[PDB]
Amino acid sequence: SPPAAPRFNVSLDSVPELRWLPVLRHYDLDLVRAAMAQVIGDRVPKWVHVLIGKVVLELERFLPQPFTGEIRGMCDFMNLSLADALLVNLAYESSVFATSIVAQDSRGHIYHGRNLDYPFGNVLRKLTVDVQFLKNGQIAFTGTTFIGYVGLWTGQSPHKFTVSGDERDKGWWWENAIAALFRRHIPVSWLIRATLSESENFEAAVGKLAKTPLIADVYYIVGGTSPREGVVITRNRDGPADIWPLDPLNGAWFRVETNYDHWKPAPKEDDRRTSAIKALNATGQANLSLEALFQILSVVPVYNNFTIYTTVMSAGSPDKYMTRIRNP
Numbered sequence: 001s002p003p004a005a006p007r008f009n010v011s012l013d014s015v016p017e018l019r020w021l022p023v024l025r026h027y028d029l030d031l032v033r034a035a036m037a038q039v040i041g042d043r044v045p046k047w048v049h050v051l052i053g054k055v056v057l058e059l060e061r062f063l064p065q066p067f068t069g070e071i072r073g074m075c076d077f078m079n080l081s082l083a084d085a086l087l088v089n090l091a092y093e094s095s096v097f098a099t100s101i102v103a104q105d106s107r108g109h110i111y112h113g114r115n116l117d118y119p120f121g122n123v124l125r126k127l128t129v130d131v132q133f134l135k136n137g138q139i140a141f142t143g144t145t146f147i148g149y150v151g152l153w154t155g156q157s158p159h160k161f162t163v164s165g166d167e168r169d170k171g172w173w174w175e176n177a178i179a180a181l182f183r184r185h186i187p188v189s190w191l192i193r194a195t196l197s198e199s200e201n202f203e204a205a206v207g208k209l210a211k212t213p214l215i216a217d218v219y220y221i222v223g224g225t226s227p228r229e230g231v232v233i234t235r236n237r238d239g240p241a242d243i244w245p246l247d248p249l250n251g252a253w254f255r256v257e258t259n260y261d262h263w264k265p266a267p268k269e270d271d272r273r274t275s276a277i278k279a280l281n282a283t284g285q286a287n288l289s290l291e292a293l294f295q296i297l298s299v300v301p302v303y304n305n306f307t308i309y310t311t312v313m314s315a316g317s318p319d320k321y322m323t324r325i326r327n328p
């Protein structure tokens with residue numbers, strides 16, 4: 001059976017530059033550096049590496065807190081350049097594949113599950129962690145991430161909402177991202193974390209995730225705590241291209257999103273959407289549970305050779321947030 005991801009706490013009462021240090025000390029930084037060094041060489045184009053290396057300090061002015069400070073803190077503790085630490089944190093914003101599911105059972109309770117896939121040789125499975133971010137000793141929100149990565153592709157605000165992000169690949173990622181960063185747009189995984197931290201309820205989270213300027217396109221899957229509180233937000237950098245909510249009155253008790261626009265067919269080369277829908281159809285609304293979602297997310301090719309982890313969560317039952325490493 002897949003093992004649960006290591007769980008750690010991160011205190012938001014500590015300043016950004018030191019928050020992650022207690023967590024980093026549990027890891028072999030030789031492994032982390034080797035992994036970060038590999039990603040730069042593998043995922044960052046040469047012209048980007050040259051450019052950011054020279055202008056990182058000018059770019060830092062336009063980046064938001066506390067993300068820069070947390071990256072700066074990981075710079076010093078690992079003897080890595082600020083440019084390289086920033087680049088790795090941007091490299092994982094793209095080339096990440098996913099399946100996200102938000103669904104409503106017969107009682108109107110909301111369930112949320114997702115797979116995250118990375119199609120390159122990696123040590124992400126060894127660096128995946130569930131993190132509880134604390135304010136005054138209390139859990140403000142929970143997220144799943146990789147050691148050294150300050151954004152959240154997956155997270156939960158207890159008794160409020162759950163969020164997962166799927167990449168929306170429209171090409172020219174680095175060209176548009178750099179220009180967007182200098183215009184104070186933010187990474188898609190950083191917006192998820194900022195939403196988990198700030199938004200007071202599901203409705204407010206959907207608004208913030210739908211409208212905040214981004215450096216790239218993305219799909220945001222959001223689940224709430226009341227019946228019908230589930231939505232797929234298809235984003236472009238400036239705003240929402242499409243808002244796709246649960247619609248039980250019309251028989252739509254789930255929404256599936258992989259990495260493609262739902263109003264178009266999934267590509268024949270990569271049709272994880274069809275498999276997920278059939279498994280949900282076979283499971284049935286009456287049998288929907290977090291465990292049932294985990295089983296759906298274990299069906300090939302929804303579950304595939306590149307799957308890093310599987311997360312199931314329900315904001316109404318925050319204690320059930322569970323991330324399991326796949327293919328370990």
Ligand SMILES: *[C@@H]1O[C@H](CO)[C@@H](O[C@@H]2O[C@H](CO)[C@@H](O)[C@H](O)[C@H]2NC(C)=O)[C@H](O)[C@H]1NC(C)=O
Binds near residue numbers: 009132137138139
């Ligand atoms: C991670 O943070 C949680 C939340 O603050 C910690 O749980 C608290 O632990 C103290 C001491 O055991 C208790 O007095 C609190 O009531 C606990 N609260 C909850 C909700 O569990 C947890 O101990 C922290 N983990 C570690 C390893 O320190």
Ligand SMILES: *[C@@H]1O[C@H](CO)[C@@H](O)[C@H](O)[C@H]1NC(C)=O
Binds near residue numbers: 274277278281
């Ligand atoms: C799912 O079920 C609905 C209703 O039963 C059906 O119309 C649809 O074709 C099914 N889709 C798949 C992929 O099984």
Ligand SMILES: [Cl-]
Binds near residue numbers: 186191195
């Ligand atoms: Cl923000």
Ligand SMILES: [Cl-]
Binds near residue numbers: 012066193194197
């Ligand atoms: Cl935060």
Ligand SMILES: [Cl-]
Binds near residue numbers: 108227228248249
């Ligand atoms: Cl309903």
Ligand SMILES: [Cl-]
Binds near residue numbers: 258
């Ligand atoms: Cl899709």
Ligand SMILES: [Cl-]
Binds near residue numbers: 289290291
């Ligand atoms: Cl459940």
